[PDB]
């Protein structure tokens, strides 16, 4: 996986490393799941999410 294709499979941010290596990362207010790709909120009001809609699906 390389970050230029399909975002490296990352939900959010992606860094290429020497080798066939890639590390996904998450914005502040999120943490990376054990899949190495997914980001889940760690705070009540993470950036870029709409509370009234996130509760309309909670």
């Amino acid at each position: 996986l390389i970050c230029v294709n399909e975002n490296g499979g990352c939900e959010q941010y992606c860094s290429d490393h020497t080798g066939t290596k890639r590390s996904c990362r998450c914005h502040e207010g999120y943490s990376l799941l054990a899949d190495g790709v997914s980001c889940t909120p760690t705070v009540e009001y993470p950036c870029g999410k709409i509370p009234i809609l996130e509760k309309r699906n909670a």
Binding site: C3, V4, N7, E11, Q12, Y13, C14, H27, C39, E44, Y45, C47, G48, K49, I50, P51, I52, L53
Partner: protein, 250 residues
């Protein structure tokens, strides 16, 4: 905003309204509890830097519903490369005097990393643009916050599809050439927000165009990806006396 719809209250929670002496000036985008991104050109005619107010959680300008939060603007930071009365480098970073409180109605838009924004977000076709600008060319401004979905063009395509300043690498086109749908001057400074896998990000700033929703012409937006490291560095800096700050770019 021409040809959009009302943003349901709370669905544009990052939108900022900028006022000078109580009068609508521009939009902006909340990116943290103390930081707002807007357009440099919003500030070209400011006399008293100390009567600039930012409002978060606004929706209907006719009423107070208790979700609004007003703050003084402590710092307006503009890149050294921006020249007043011209189009390039049209971005400003605003420091609020005290943080806003995040609530259902007040939430930051994510400022993306440069690589993500260039490699991924730049290829998402549609993004939302919002503001309390004119509903029609030569018309009244909106009382309720409006939102519009617009498609992004590659600049070579924008130039071919259009028929005046250069579209530089610090800009991008989005919208429609048929006169139906656009942002307009009173939306200046507001967000061009891009959805990717469940999260929204800041990709552009309402910057310029011809007239408003003018046939043959697309909206032009500041390309925020060019400014990520410039913004992040400034967000780590101490405030300085005097509201306006010109900061080196790059």
């Amino acid at each position: 905003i021409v040809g959009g719809k009302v943003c349901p209250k709370g669905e544009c929670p990052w939108q900022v309204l900028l006022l000078v002496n109580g009068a609508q000036l521009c939009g902006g985008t909340l990116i943290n509890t103390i930081w707002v991104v807007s357009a440099a050109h919003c500030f070209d005619k400011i006399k008293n830097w100390r009567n600039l107010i930012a409002v978060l959680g606004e929706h209907d300008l006719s009423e107070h519903d208790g979700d609004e939060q007003s703050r003084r603007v402590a710092q307006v930071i503009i890149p050294s490369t921006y020249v007043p009365g011209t189009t390039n480098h049209d971005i400003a970073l605003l420091r609020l005097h005290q943080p806003v409180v995040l609530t259902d109605h007040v939430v930051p838009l994510c400022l993306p990393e440069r690589t993500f924004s260039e490699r991924t977000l730049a290829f998402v076709r549609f993004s939302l643009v919002s503001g309390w600008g004119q509903l029609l060319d030569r018309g009244a401004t909106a009382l309720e916050l409006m939102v519009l979905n617009v498609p992004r063009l590659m600049t070579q395509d924008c130039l071919q599809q259009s028929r005046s300043p250069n579209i530089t690498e610090y800009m991008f086109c989005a919208g429609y050439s048929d006169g139906s749908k656009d942002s307009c001057k009173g939306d200046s400074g507001g967000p061009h927000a891009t959805h990717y896998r469940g999260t929204w990000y800041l990709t552009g700033i309402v910057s310029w165009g011809q007239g408003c929703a003018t046939v043959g012409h697309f909206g032009v937006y500041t390309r925020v990806s060019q400014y990520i490291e410039w913004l992040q560095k400034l967000m780590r800096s101490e405030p300085r006396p005097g509201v306006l700050l010109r900061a080196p770019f790059p």
